[PDB]
Amino acid sequence: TELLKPRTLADLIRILHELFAGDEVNVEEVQAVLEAYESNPAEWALYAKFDQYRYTRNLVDQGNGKFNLMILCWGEGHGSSIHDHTDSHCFLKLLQGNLKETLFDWPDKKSNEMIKKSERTLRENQCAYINDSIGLHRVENVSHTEPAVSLHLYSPPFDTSHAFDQRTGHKNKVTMTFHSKFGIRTP
């Protein structure tokens, strides 16, 4: 229960394994520890593998089955769908650059435009949190000049989730694909 500042990415991962040793999740503690880690680009360069056309997901740690820890690499103008998180916790920490997070409510059955609830700018080293009970979101690198890199933790792990059509609120199931795992490109 005593949270210490992670010295390095490796140290962070060790602390995370401790925090997820059990069956439940202390969200505030996990968020605090992620925020306390000061991004050091040398430590995660191995995972920072970009694609020219869309953002990439790069698996870093499998949390001994309790969580997926991954690094997402967002080119200029790259962004996500409006999506849920499959009944899992989702932590988002910025390692480089800025991302815009837009929040949406769960849609009703009637086909309507999904209206933004709010938006915020996540800045370097900040850590956001979302779950399905909170709502849906879109994450975007709106920069024209700076790539963004973020560190994501999902617990329990999931490899499918839903994308939502902003015009209708209709959803479709999407399978998550990893661009790399443990620094190895996995085509």
Q: Which residues are annotated as a binding site for Fe cation?
A: 83, 85, 137
Measured distance CA(80)–CA(168) in Å, rounded: 17
Measured distance CA(58)–CA(182) in Å, rounded: 8
- 19: part of which helix (H) or strand (E)? helix 9-19
Measured distance CA(80)–CA(13) in Å, rounded: 25
User: Do 36 and 126 touch, CB atoms closer than 8 A?
Assistant: no
Tokens 């309790």 belong to which residue? 66
Give the annotated binding-site residues. 83, 85, 137
